Design a protein around this motif. Structure first.
Motif, PDB file in Angstrom:
ATOM      1  N   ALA A 128       0.838  -1.200   0.000  1.00  0.00           N
ATOM      2  CA  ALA A 128       0.000   0.000   0.000  1.00  0.00           C
ATOM      3  C   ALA A 128       0.868   1.243   0.000  1.00  0.00           C
ATOM      4  O   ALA A 128       0.589   2.180  -0.744  1.00  0.00           O
ATOM      5  CB  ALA A 128      -0.905   0.010   1.215  1.00  0.00           C
ATOM      6  N   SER A 129       1.951   1.241   0.796  1.00  0.00           N
ATOM      7  CA  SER A 129       2.861   2.384   0.847  1.00  0.00           C
ATOM      8  C   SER A 129       3.477   2.702  -0.543  1.00  0.00           C
ATOM      9  O   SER A 129       3.692   3.873  -0.846  1.00  0.00           O
ATOM     10  CB  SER A 129       3.935   2.178   1.916  1.00  0.00           C
ATOM     11  N   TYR A 130       3.713   1.683  -1.391  1.00  0.00           N
ATOM     12  CA  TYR A 130       4.241   1.911  -2.730  1.00  0.00           C
ATOM     13  C   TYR A 130       3.127   2.383  -3.633  1.00  0.00           C
ATOM     14  O   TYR A 130       3.363   3.248  -4.479  1.00  0.00           O
ATOM     15  CB  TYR A 130       4.919   0.670  -3.304  1.00  0.00           C
ATOM     16  N   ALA A 134       3.234   5.831  -5.689  1.00  0.00           N
ATOM     17  CA  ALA A 134       2.963   5.886  -7.138  1.00  0.00           C
ATOM     18  C   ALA A 134       1.865   6.895  -7.522  1.00  0.00           C
ATOM     19  O   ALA A 134       1.997   7.592  -8.536  1.00  0.00           O
ATOM     20  CB  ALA A 134       2.606   4.512  -7.677  1.00  0.00           C
ATOM     21  N   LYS A 135       0.811   6.999  -6.692  1.00  0.00           N
ATOM     22  CA  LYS A 135      -0.315   7.899  -6.952  1.00  0.00           C
ATOM     23  C   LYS A 135      -0.074   9.347  -6.521  1.00  0.00           C
ATOM     24  O   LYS A 135      -0.398  10.252  -7.268  1.00  0.00           O
ATOM     25  CB  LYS A 135      -1.581   7.339  -6.283  1.00  0.00           C
ATOM     26  N   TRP A 177       5.552   4.144   6.416  1.00  0.00           N
ATOM     27  CA  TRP A 177       6.312   3.499   5.340  1.00  0.00           C
ATOM     28  C   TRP A 177       6.482   4.416   4.121  1.00  0.00           C
ATOM     29  O   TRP A 177       7.572   4.495   3.559  1.00  0.00           O
ATOM     30  CB  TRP A 177       5.624   2.194   4.911  1.00  0.00           C
ATOM     31  N   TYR A 178       5.391   5.075   3.704  1.00  0.00           N
ATOM     32  CA  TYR A 178       5.333   6.024   2.576  1.00  0.00           C
ATOM     33  C   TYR A 178       6.421   7.109   2.708  1.00  0.00           C
ATOM     34  O   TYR A 178       7.094   7.443   1.720  1.00  0.00           O
ATOM     35  CB  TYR A 178       3.915   6.628   2.536  1.00  0.00           C
ATOM     36  N   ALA A 179       6.629   7.614   3.943  1.00  0.00           N
ATOM     37  CA  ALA A 179       7.682   8.581   4.244  1.00  0.00           C
ATOM     38  C   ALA A 179       9.063   8.079   3.794  1.00  0.00           C
ATOM     39  O   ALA A 179       9.860   8.882   3.326  1.00  0.00           O
ATOM     40  CB  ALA A 179       7.714   8.887   5.729  1.00  0.00           C
ATOM     41  N   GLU A 180       9.326   6.762   3.873  1.00  0.00           N
ATOM     42  CA  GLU A 180      10.611   6.187   3.464  1.00  0.00           C
ATOM     43  C   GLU A 180      10.802   6.113   1.944  1.00  0.00           C
ATOM     44  O   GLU A 180      11.905   5.800   1.515  1.00  0.00           O
ATOM     45  CB  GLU A 180      10.809   4.769   4.021  1.00  0.00           C
ATOM     46  N   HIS A 181       9.752   6.316   1.130  1.00  0.00           N
ATOM     47  CA  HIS A 181       9.880   6.215  -0.328  1.00  0.00           C
ATOM     48  C   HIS A 181      10.087   7.576  -1.013  1.00  0.00           C
ATOM     49  O   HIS A 181       9.993   7.634  -2.237  1.00  0.00           O
ATOM     50  CB  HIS A 181       8.647   5.514  -0.923  1.00  0.00           C
ATOM     51  N   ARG A 182      10.397   8.656  -0.260  1.00  0.00           N
ATOM     52  CA  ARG A 182      10.623   9.983  -0.844  1.00  0.00           C
ATOM     53  C   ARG A 182      11.769   9.899  -1.868  1.00  0.00           C
ATOM     54  O   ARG A 182      12.782   9.254  -1.598  1.00  0.00           O
ATOM     55  CB  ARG A 182      10.950  11.036   0.242  1.00  0.00           C
ATOM     56  N   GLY A 183      11.543  10.462  -3.055  1.00  0.00           N
ATOM     57  CA  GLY A 183      12.512  10.477  -4.143  1.00  0.00           C
ATOM     58  C   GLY A 183      12.185   9.526  -5.273  1.00  0.00           C
ATOM     59  O   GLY A 183      12.629   9.755  -6.400  1.00  0.00           O
ATOM     60  N   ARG A 184      11.418   8.447  -4.994  1.00  0.00           N
ATOM     61  CA  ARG A 184      11.064   7.474  -6.023  1.00  0.00           C
ATOM     62  C   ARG A 184       9.962   7.979  -6.965  1.00  0.00           C
ATOM     63  O   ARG A 184       8.928   8.471  -6.521  1.00  0.00           O
ATOM     64  CB  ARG A 184      10.689   6.120  -5.399  1.00  0.00           C
ATOM     65  N   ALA A 185      10.198   7.859  -8.272  1.00  0.00           N
ATOM     66  CA  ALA A 185       9.226   8.239  -9.306  1.00  0.00           C
ATOM     67  C   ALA A 185       8.004   7.298  -9.326  1.00  0.00           C
ATOM     68  O   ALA A 185       8.009   6.260  -8.661  1.00  0.00           O
ATOM     69  CB  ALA A 185       9.894   8.222 -10.675  1.00  0.00           C
ATOM     70  N   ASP A 187       6.947   5.338 -11.814  1.00  0.00           N
ATOM     71  CA  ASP A 187       7.344   4.044 -12.383  1.00  0.00           C
ATOM     72  C   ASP A 187       8.232   3.249 -11.451  1.00  0.00           C
ATOM     73  O   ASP A 187       8.122   2.026 -11.409  1.00  0.00           O
ATOM     74  CB  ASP A 187       7.981   4.184 -13.776  1.00  0.00           C
ATOM     75  N   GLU A 188       9.055   3.928 -10.665  1.00  0.00           N
ATOM     76  CA  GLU A 188       9.919   3.253  -9.704  1.00  0.00           C
ATOM     77  C   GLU A 188       9.087   2.640  -8.561  1.00  0.00           C
ATOM     78  O   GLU A 188       9.327   1.497  -8.180  1.00  0.00           O
ATOM     79  CB  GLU A 188      10.962   4.227  -9.146  1.00  0.00           C
ATOM     80  N   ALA A 189       8.096   3.387  -8.044  1.00  0.00           N
ATOM     81  CA  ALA A 189       7.197   2.919  -6.990  1.00  0.00           C
ATOM     82  C   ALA A 189       6.392   1.722  -7.475  1.00  0.00           C
ATOM     83  O   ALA A 189       6.278   0.731  -6.761  1.00  0.00           O
ATOM     84  CB  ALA A 189       6.253   4.037  -6.583  1.00  0.00           C
ATOM     85  N   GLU A 190       5.852   1.804  -8.702  1.00  0.00           N
ATOM     86  CA  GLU A 190       5.066   0.724  -9.310  1.00  0.00           C
ATOM     87  C   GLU A 190       5.904  -0.522  -9.504  1.00  0.00           C
ATOM     88  O   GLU A 190       5.382  -1.618  -9.356  1.00  0.00           O
ATOM     89  CB  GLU A 190       4.453   1.179 -10.642  1.00  0.00           C
TER      90      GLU A 190
END
Length: 325
Positions: A128-130, A134-135, A177-185, A187-190
């Motif tokens: 869910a965090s990814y 992505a969204k 968890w979402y806070a840890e994905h800062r910087g990912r585009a 397509d990268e998140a998906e």
């Protein structure tokens, strides 16, 4: 003669949007399929198909047959679902285009959220965090305040119902968890989503209710790697597996399939499936998954011989240059 229309409206539903086209009356499944792929800007077409419903079962449009010669409800507009019919062995390596990655991501995510693929609780929260990254893009506390994911479908109902935590508590767990994905585009998140999803046990498996010769109820799994026999009480782990390169042949005869192992020491595995409509799908998926598996092996071995050659060429080239000094 020239007054009867040359086309009919077809509605095509993708995981993204719906769209309509003018299907020529003479067109085969291939013509309609190629038009959809061209429109989408999708070149990695082999994973996809156009699905409709015969009675209660799914049916894929056959490429060599006329669209109108299929048993599809002809109520305006004739509708098809553009979905992935085959899964790659390694999504990151194989799904080159962004559109392909995006379509796989949305379909697989829908399977996870609809509980078609079992997903454990912690995995579901990470997934869910990814999906949120992505969204929504990078997490911004000034914009993404408490309740920002209140209207979002983010976890399977099964996972929500195991804990009886509030929507705001699930949102907090997801946001951490979402806070840890800062910087990912996007397509990268998906793609991080797909890398987790592709390691789920039920991912990419086409299940069919089958019976053995003794009448024992089992489940057949047809996937990118081979044929698998599950005990109906366990869809996660199959009890027997026949990888595509370890099968001599598969033969079908009067509602009975026979898997012939490559190892003549292993006896043939016979199973029954009642519906002929289902038996056509099983064969389709066996022939086509087998073929894609073989092609991956041909691509793998060719890729090795290209490196080996390029390394020899480049090493020998560099040696030749050193001797000229």
């Amino acid at each position: 003669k020239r007054k009867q229309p040359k086309t009919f409206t077809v509605r095509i539903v993708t995981m993204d949007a719906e769209m309509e086209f003018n299907c020529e009356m003479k067109w085969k499944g291939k013509d309609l399929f190629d038009l959809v792929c061209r429109t989408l800007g999708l070149r990695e077409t082999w994973f996809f198909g156009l699905q409709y419903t015969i009675k209660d079962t799914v049916a894929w449009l056959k490429m060599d047959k006329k669209v109108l010669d299929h048993d599809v409800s002809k109520e305006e507009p004739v509708t098809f679902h553009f979905l992935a019919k085959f899964y790659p062995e390694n999504a990151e390596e194989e799904l080159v285009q962004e559109i392909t990655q995006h379509l796989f991501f949305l379909q697989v995510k829908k399977q996870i959220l609809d509980e078609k693929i079992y997903c454990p609780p912690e995995a579901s929260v990470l997934l869910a965090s990814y999906a949120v990254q992505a969204k929504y893009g990078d997490y911004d506390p000034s914009v993404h305040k408490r309740g920002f994911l209140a209207q979002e479908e983010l976890l399977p109902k099964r996972v929500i119902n195991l804990y009886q935590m509030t929507p705001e508590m699930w949102e907090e767990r997801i946001t951490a968890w979402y806070a840890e994905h800062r910087g990912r585009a996007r397509d990268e998140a998906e793609m991080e989503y797909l890398k987790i999803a592709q390691d789920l046990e039920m991912y990419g498996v086409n299940y069919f209710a089958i019976r053995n010769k003794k009448g024992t109820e089992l489940l057949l799994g047809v996937d990118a790697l081979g044929l698998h026999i599950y005990d109906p009480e366990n869809r996660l782990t199959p009890k027997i597996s026949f990888p595509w390169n370890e099968i001599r042949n598969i033969s079908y005869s009067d509602k009975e399939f026979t898997i012939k192992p490559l190892d003549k020491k292993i006896d043939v595995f016979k199973f029954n499936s009642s519906k002929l409509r289902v038996n056509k799908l099983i064969l389709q998926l066996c022939i086509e998954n087998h073929d894609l598996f073989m092609r991956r092996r041909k691509a793998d071995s060719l890729e090795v011989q290209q490196m080996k050659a390029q390394a020899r060429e480049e090493k020998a080239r560099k040696q030749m240059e050193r001797q000229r000094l």
